Design a protein around this nucleic acid. Structure first.
Ligand code: CA
Ligand code: CA
Lengths: 237, 229
DNA sequence: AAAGATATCTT
DNA sequence: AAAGATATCTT
């Protein structure tokens, strides 16, 4: 499948290469800082050619957002079937020590999942899968080409997984003012395996479509999956 | 001085990719998210070089949502610290200049050292003009750059601050909306840093609230006449 | 505009 | 946890 091939190619590339700096055309190399804003940019850039290669191998077109502030990082589709599009989005978080619990912010809950054309490259309904490539890294002068192995890398270990967004979605927000879905707070294994909390993608969608932006508003409705299932039991009242 | 040396070093000092230790190069994306990361990484060695030359220790933040990107100080003068923060935008200008509800209202909020320890707050602002999914080999000249040209300036934060917010839910100060030249020259709107700070320390978050207080510099000045009521 | 998206972190 | 910072762009 595209999905096993992509997984395999990402896992592989991640093991065979370590990014250590940005290079100028004149050949000066600048090292990397160890902030997730640097590492998410790097990981996104490192992934693009792999997605592209595996996509070509299966006849999919890859499109990236033309405008900024649009989901997804990559839309793949076969020209023959334009309405069965796949959304791939890259997410990153850090760990201080391998094997700690991690969590991701999984995108806004008030944009495309509530309004089919808000902040998304194609209408939401044209997508049949939303995959998350998640990167987890353990956080840890200019140089010349002759020094590539000498530059200190700003991370100790990097792990990557591909999983469906609904599968790893949690029931608490990942951010307040920017209203993001929070993922499960779990070990890396759990993301790989897909040990989430929702039973279907329909349940995930109904929960985040009806989630209220503040706890004073949520106090009356639901604040987690068990209160949501009770709320549903009783007739959404 | 440190400031003229840094400005000279920045003007004096073109990135086309990230490189792996194995020598494969991955090209650069087009979003400002990519380029803000690149211009910060580009400036760190410059800043550190100049700083060293003038006897200043440079410190980056440990926590990821703290200001500033670089704190510079002589260990002999620790309440004469300098804040340098890198800001980026594109042209096919205005900058967002940081929150107005964190350290300017609360001395230790989201800042590496207490706000009172800093004697200057410089902005290095990069402006790039907007214009591959293959990897390259150490082919550098064949790699497409995602930008057509880049300009940089160093200026004091108060001189280029505007009077309209630069963002809504993340409550940022907006700069003057001006030509590159005006930022270089420092053709701002506030009379002093004292006025810049009092305007932003009392700026209300929404238009509702603002409509009974002030929305721009003329209205703030009239609010001062009124007795800050 | 002014308001709210894009992504992730900190307490 | 919930809420609000970090940076910048879009409508
Ligand atoms: Ca994305
Ligand atoms: Ca900064």
């Amino acid at each position: 499948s595209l999905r096993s091939d992509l997984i395999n190619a990402l896992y592989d590339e991640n093991q065979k290469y370590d990014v250590c700096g940005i290079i100028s055309a004149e050949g000066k190399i600048y090292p990397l800082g160890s902030d997730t804003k640097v590492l998410s940019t790097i990981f996104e850039l490192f992934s693009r050619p792999i997605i592209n290669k595996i996509a070509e191998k299966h006849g999919y077109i890859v499109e990236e957002p033309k405008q900024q502030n649009h989901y997804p990082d990559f839309t793949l589709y076969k020209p023959s079937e334009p309405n069965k599009k796949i959304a791939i989005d890259i997410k990153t978080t850090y760990t201080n020590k391998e094997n700690e619990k991690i969590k991701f912010t999984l995108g806004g809950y008030t944009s495309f999942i509530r309004n089919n054309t808000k902040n998304i490259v194609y209408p939401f309904d044209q997508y049949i899968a939303h995959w998350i490539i998640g990167y987890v890294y353990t956080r840890v002068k200019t140089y010349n080409i002759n020094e590539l192995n000498e530059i200190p890398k700003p991370y100790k270990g990097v792990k990557v997984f591909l999983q469906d967004k609904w599968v790893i979605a949690g029931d608490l927000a990942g951010s307040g003012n920017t209203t993001n879905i929070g993922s499960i707070h779990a070990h890396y294994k759990d993301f790989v395996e897909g040990k989430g909390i929702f039973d279907s993608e329909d349940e995930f969608l109904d929960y985040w479509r009806n989630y209220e932006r503040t706890s004073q508003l949520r106090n009356d409705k639901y604040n987690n999956i068990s209160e949501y299932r009770n709320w549903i039991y009783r007739g959404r009242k």
